[PDB]
């Protein structure tokens, strides 16, 4: 049993857009844009919607770059996070109730202030390799187990 989530990384040649999460889950950490996938929308539509809701950005097209399953010790449901990237955004990022956007250079990504797993799979993201990840967490800071493999289709 798992719940679908989306995650969107606005990746441009020399920079990436991240949102400081202001309230709730993953608060105080930089991350891509996303959330729960709703009933009546595709995974890609939920990703575009969550990008719009959190950053005010529309996009020409999104591409599937990976799937990461997260297990939290004690919680029965897994988080099945579908990851997306994009280059051509439309408009300028604006602050929402959830997210404060900010550009970062690719060698200045604040992994110390992000979900610890990001360290592991970002390199594949930057290399444009598709991937399947799994991370078993104890609380929000400790990875107990993980797997990570290159794939051909997500
Ligand atoms: C647990 N480790 C993790 N590493 C990277 N991204 C994560 C994550 N756990 C959740 N996320 C992402 C998936 C969604 O885009 C968002 C959670 O949605 P929410 O902020 O609406 O609760 O954060």
Q: Is the CB of 84 under 6 A from ligand 1?
A: no
Contacts of 28 (CB under 8 A, 6+ apart): 20, 21, 113
SS (H, E, C) the chain: CEEEEEEEEEEECCEEEEEEECCCCCCCCEECEEEECCCCCCHHHHHHHHHHHHHCCEECCCEEEEEEEEEECCCCCEEEEEEEEECCEECCCCCCCCEEEEEEECCCCCHHHECCCHHHHHHHHHCCCEEEEEEEEECCCEEEEEEEEEECCC
Query: CA dist 6 to 14, 35, 63, 67, Å?
Result: 23, 6, 12, 9
- Quick check: CB of 25 below 6 Å from ligand 1? yes
Distance of CA 101 to the CA centre of its chain: 14
Q: What is the resolution of this structure in A?
A: 2.5
- The C-alpha atoms of residue 110 and residue 96 are separated, in whole angstroms, by 21
HSE-CB for 97 with a 13 A CA cutoff: 3
The closest alpha carbon to 82, from 8, 1, 10, belongs to 8
Measured between alpha carbons, how far is residue 29 from residues 22, 39, 153 in Å?
Answer: 8, 27, 29
Dist. CA 88 → ligand 1 center (Å): 23
Q: Which of 48, 100, 115, 136 to mutate to test the pocket of ligand 1 (most atoms within 8 A of CB)?
A: 115
71 Cβ inside 6 Å of ligand 1: no
Domain count of the fold of the chain: 1
- d(CA 55, CA 99) in angstroms, rounded, equals 7
Q: Mutate which of 22, 81, 138 to test ligand 1's pocket (most atoms within 8 Å of Cβ)?
A: 81
Structural domain boundaries enclosing 11: 1-154
Nearest Cα to Cα of residue 47 among 71, 65, 30: 65
* Chain CA centroid to CA 90, Å: 19
CA separation for the pair 123, 30 (Å, rounded)? 17
CATH assignment at residue 148:
3.90.79.10
Q: How was this one solved?
A: X-ray
Q: Tokens in use for 33?
A: 């844009």
């Amino acid at each position: 049993a798992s719940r679908l989530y989306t995650l969107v990384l606005v990746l441009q040649p020399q920079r990436v857009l991240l949102g400081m999460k202001k309230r709730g889950f993953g608060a105080g950490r930089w991350n891509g844009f996303g959330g729960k996938v709703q009933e009546g929308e595709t995974i890609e539509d939920g990703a575009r919607r969550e990008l719009q809701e959190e950053s005010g950005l529309t996009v020409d097209a999104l591409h599937k770059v990976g799937q990461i399953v997260f297990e939290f010790v004690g919680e029965p449901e897994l988080m099945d996070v579908h990851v997306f990237c994009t280059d051509s955004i439309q408009g300028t990022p604006v602050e929402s109730d959830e997210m404060r956007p900010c550009w970062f250079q690719l060698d200045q990504i604040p992994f110390k202030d992000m979900w610890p797993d990001d360290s592991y799979w970002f390199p594949l993201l930057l290399q444009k390799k598709k991937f399947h990840g799994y991370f078993k967490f104890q609380g929000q800071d400790t990875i107990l187990d993980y797997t990570l493999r290159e794939v051909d289709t997500v």
